[PDB]
Amino acid sequence: APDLRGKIALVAGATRGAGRAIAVQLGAAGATVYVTGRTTRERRSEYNRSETIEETAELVTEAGGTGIAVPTDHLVPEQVRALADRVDTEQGRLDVLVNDVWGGERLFEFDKKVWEHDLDAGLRLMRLGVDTHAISSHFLLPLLVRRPGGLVVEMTDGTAAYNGSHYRNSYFYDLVKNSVLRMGYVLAHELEPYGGTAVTLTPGWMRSEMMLETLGVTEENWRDALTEVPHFCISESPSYVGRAVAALAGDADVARWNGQSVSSGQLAQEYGFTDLDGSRPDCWRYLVEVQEAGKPADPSGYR
Amino acid sequence: TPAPDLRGKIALVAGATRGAGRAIAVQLGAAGATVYVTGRTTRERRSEYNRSETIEETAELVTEAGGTGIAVPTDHLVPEQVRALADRVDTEQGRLDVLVNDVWGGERLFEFDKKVWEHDLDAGLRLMRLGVDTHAISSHFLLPLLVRRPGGLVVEMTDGTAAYNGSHYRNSYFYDLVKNSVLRMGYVLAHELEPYGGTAVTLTPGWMRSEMMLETLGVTEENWRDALTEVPHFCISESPSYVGRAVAALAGDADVARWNGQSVSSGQLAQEYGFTDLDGSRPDCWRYLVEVQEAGKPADPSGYR
Ligand SMILES: NC(=O)c1ccc[n+]([C@@H]2O[C@H](COP(=O)([O-])OP(=O)(O)OC[C@H]3O[C@@H](n4cnc5c(N)ncnc54)[C@H](OP(=O)(O)O)[C@@H]3O)[C@@H](O)[C@H]2O)c1
Ligand SMILES: NC(=O)c1ccc[n+]([C@@H]2O[C@H](COP(=O)([O-])OP(=O)(O)OC[C@H]3O[C@@H](n4cnc5c(N)ncnc54)[C@H](OP(=O)(O)O)[C@@H]3O)[C@@H](O)[C@H]2O)c1
């Protein structure tokens, strides 16, 4: 298991989903983790959900690290500048930056062409999914490149290999996920002279809070949903991609990944971690070799 | 090779005041097309670019070249104006054969060789909005008319090929993200258009002798090789009309669907279709950049134009 004691991490967009679980797994490895998001105990966010950023910070501490909640709208440069100033003030360093901010799960429309998709929702989802990462990198990378060994993880949906041959959901969704892949390549070029590393990371099919609610199940009985969604047998908990980030952050030779697109399932094979249940789902190979091949849902050999 | 015959075709070049946009519109007009040309700069008000070329002037050049240019001043960041533009084309023509998403507007906003934390942030966010959202809004409102019958063509204008950009960081963070998003737009739109018999490609010019570029170098088109002492690798450059002829060749290709989803360059298409630049040459910018300039060889256009 990675030892991240003494490390300073920041997960931008950590209220729920992968962001929360990445922050928690970094804390479970001993890191101090700044966690940002809009939903507080006082105010709900555009998502209109009940998970709060303060709750994430407490879960990071409970897990064995230190969670510091900083409510932040990552579309507001002044707030992200203050966030960078705070980390410098309190810690003088930043080892790991995870640009997780997405916020578009309610805005994209599946199987609508660009002229059928609601336009305002599509433009909004691209701004949330792209500009937040640009703003975060703009203000937080100076601290990260102050000394060698920094790591940036850009969070997307899909690998370069999968997305390179698959249209992803609809026009706006697809442009975001492929821009975040490009961000990993671009930041790898900018960080390498400083001894910094950038990767783009995707989870598999995540059993997020939002996903489990849609399926009407809890984590403890998630396989109850398999009659309704048989290919959900490849799914993983959000902690799996969290352990992938922790494994990268703990890798003394993480620069071997610079610029690459990686997946949680690929990194589980590489580093040997498992999901909470001991399995190692390999979503993107499963999607190609089983589901898109027309075969019946069957997880054998893929987790 | 003989010039494409686009008589009877309806085209729209979004962002056609100057540069590639103007030249694409004029070369479509020279092939006989009716061309709607849009942009913010009019004879009464200058645009964010603060330049003197106007969208009315482009429309007149389209007509002079042998087509019909219809200027529609439009801010492509304003959905209501782009909706009206689409309604107008439907009203006047009932069809749209060729859509060229040329809108860039970022030439003065990107910063060469600044890291993302050094680049001015507001300018970076602005050029991404101008370079990406304008294309999304344009496709959203104009593609319904285009897919009404088979044979429509959409050209997404970017900088670089998929092959070149896949292995090259392009200028700086924000610039790079735009050019690579527009590459992805061609792939995405090809998927959405194919069931309708529509085709999408992403096209890049080479090193263009645009109005802005020639001013930066202190030369006119008639004596552009005067700049070679200061910028030797400018020997690979092409006029904006070259990429205009590339669009006209795609628009005239009965089998243009063979390109669906692909990234293409003006130099690649000149070899494919046989057109030339105005001076009779066929510059091959992206092969030259890799095989001559980046290999450390002295500037020498032999074999590349
Ligand atoms: N169900 C899923 O979430 C799911 C499933 C499969 C794959 N993925 C992919 O995995 C990646 C990570 O997604 P995720 O699960 O972490 O998605 P997410 O929950 O949409 O994003 C993480 C958090 O970022 C915060 N955020 C959004 N906009 C913000 C802003 N302007 N300022 C500050 N914070 C903001 C949101 O919390 P606040 O509302 O509190 O700000 C949000 O809950 C995404 O690329 C996604 O496509 C997600
Ligand atoms: N050597 C080169 O210059 C070169 C080389 C390779 C690739 N490329 C690429 O080729 C592509 C096309 O280039 P270009 O020369 O046509 O660039 P451009 O002149 O920046 O774009 C064409 C016109 O679009 C208009 N426009 C911008 N924003 C607008 C908005 N919000 N609403 C309406 N119209 C708007 C502008 O006219 P108004 O100001 O009147 O609106 C602009 O002059 C660009 O992506 C460029 O990067 C260029």
Numbering used by the authors:
A (entry chain E): 9 to 311
B (entry chain A): 7 to 311
The authors write:
As a family of DNA damaging genotoxins, THIQ antibiotics exhibit remarkably potent DNA alkylating activity through the departure of hydroxy group in hemiaminal moiety followed by an attack of N-2 of guanine in GC-rich region. Here we discover a self-defense strategy featuring with reductive inactivation of hemiaminal pharmacophore by short-chain dehydrogenases/reductases (SDRs) NapW and homW, which are integrated with the naphthyridinomycin biosynthetic pathway. When the cofactor NADPH is replaced by NADH, the enzymatic efficiency was dramatically decreased. These results strongly demonstrate that NapW and homW functionally catalyze the reductive inactivation of the highly reactive iminium species, which implied that the two SDR proteins may participate in self-protection from endogenous DNA alkylation. Collectively, these results unambiguously supported our proposal that the SDRs NapW and homW axiomatically endow cells resistance to NDM for self-protection.
We further obtained the structure of NapW·NADP+ binary complex by co-crystallizing NapW, NADP(H) and compound 1 or 2. The binding of cofactor NADP+ enables loop 47–58 and loop 107–119, which are too flexible to observe in apo-NapW structure, adopt stable conformation and are clearly observed. The surface of this complex reveals the adenine terminus of NADP+ is deeply buried inside NapW and the nicotinamide moiety which delivers hydrogen to substrate locates in a wide pocket on the surface. The result indicated that Asp165 may participate in the catalytic process. To better investigate the substrate binding mechanism and the role of Asp165, we constructed the tertiary complex model of NapW·NADPH·1 by molecular docking and carried out molecular dynamics (MD) simulation experiments. We found that Asp165 could form a hydrogen bond with the C-7 hydroxy of 1 to stabilize the substrate and facilitate the dehydration process. Next, we investigated the catalytic mechanism of NapW with the quantum mechanical/molecular mechanical (QM/MM) method. It was proposed that Asp165 could facilitate the transfer of proton from the carboxyl to the C-7 hydroxy, resulting in dehydration to form the electrophilic iminium species 1′, and then the hydride delivery from NADPH to 1′ could generate the product 2.
